[PDB]
Structure 1
Amino acid sequence: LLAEYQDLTFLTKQEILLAHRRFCELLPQEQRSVESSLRAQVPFEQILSLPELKANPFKERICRVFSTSPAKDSLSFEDFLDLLSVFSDTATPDIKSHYAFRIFDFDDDGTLNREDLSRLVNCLTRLSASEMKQLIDNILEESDIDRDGTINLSEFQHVISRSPDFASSFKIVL
């Protein structure tokens, strides 16, 4: 499937152009030409102030997932478009689940462990105490098919099918 290497067609032409105008506001005046702006790398601090990210519980993590920089320390305009495409209401549930999973996998090991799931739950929530353990045990009980103690992507889709609340995280996070 290789979502990252797909050319996503979720944004309209106007959205693309408007995104470019907003991206250019983060650049020095001299880098705002079309050609200069598409070579630019914008550090996360400027991206993190945007309305799409400022109050996002996983904002630092979202920056890292969409950055195509090998240092994972900035977004190009194209990374920013990728971001807005996945965030759009038009983005398909399969694309959103893919990227939500990546976001929630903090160590990028390919699974959601007890810590990964804890942050997810906190994001929905006066937080839970050590009743967080109770909750996580029941998710694994239902959806940890290979019984490895973690939740992989397939199992994640099961959880999403089971829980309106976890499914609502897609609107919160993307």
Structure 2
Amino acid sequence: SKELLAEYQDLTFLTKQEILLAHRRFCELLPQEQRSVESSLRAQVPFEQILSLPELKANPFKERICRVFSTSPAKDSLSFEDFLDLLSVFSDTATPDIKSHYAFRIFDFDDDGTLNREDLSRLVNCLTGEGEDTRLSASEMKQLIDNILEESDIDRDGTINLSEFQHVISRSPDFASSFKIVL
């Protein structure tokens, strides 16, 4: 967490200065629960420390964002290796498939993989919706989703892995292209 030395496994879309700027942001994020003595490294940064700054309050996905980043147990959460691998998904450079995989992992909340077809159709629309969709564009892309539900067969199945459904949206629709951050 606090040092740049011990085994950072980061196959990532950030160069040497982008990593150093993101480390300075992680160092401003680190000290309140560990304030002066920096002891619990692969454990802090927690959700109490993410909730500490102004615009992380009425954002309903901030604990879901933290859980896809690392986490599993309470307070043992986003280490610096997790801190680079997460923002690499949103880097303006990274692929539309890794951004659609992250949109899946927000709706698939309790560990497993199999979400409901309604949460899958809401995942594709909560993207196509942010990225410039009027009433004729939303009807045309939901008629496109009805054909992607036929051959990745939804009646008989019910609960679904989006691993198949992201590779079929990587043809065109829609905000999986610009699901991105400024670093």
Report the TM-score when normalising by structure 2.
0.61
Secondary structure of the residue aligned to 2:21 is helix
1:30-72: CA deviation from partner (whole Å, max 9, x where unpaired): 9689976845602224335779977866332121011146447
Greater RCO, 1 or 2 (C-alpha within 8 Å, sep 6+): 2
Following superposition, the deviation at residue 106 of structure 1 comes to 2.0
Structure 1's 172 and 62: CA in aligned 2 closer, same or farther, altered over 3 A?
A: same
CA distance in 2, matches of 1:152, 1:115: 12
Unaligned residue ranges in structure 2 (runs of 5+): 128-133
**Identical residues among aligned pairs (%):** 100
Greater CA drift, 69-78 or 105-114: 69-78
Greater CA drift, 45-54 or 91-100: 45-54
**How many pairs align?**
174
1:89-108: CA deviation from partner (whole Å, max 9, x where unpaired): 22234433433332331233
Secondary structure of the residue aligned to 1:166 is coil
Secondary structure of the residue aligned to 1:8 is coil
Task: Tell whether 2:60 aligns with 1:57.
Answer: yes
Q: Give the structure with the larger helix fraction.
A: 1
RMSD: 5.8
CA distance in 2, matches of 1:47, 1:24: 12
CA distance in 2, matches of 1:173, 1:135: 31
Whether the 8 Å contact between 2:99 and 2:176 is mirrored in structure 1 is no
Unaligned residue ranges in structure 1 (runs of 5+): none
Whether the 8 Å contact between 2:23 and 2:80 is mirrored in structure 1 is yes
**Greater Rg, structure 1 or structure 2?**
2
Whether the 8 Å contact between 2:152 and 2:164 is mirrored in structure 1 is yes
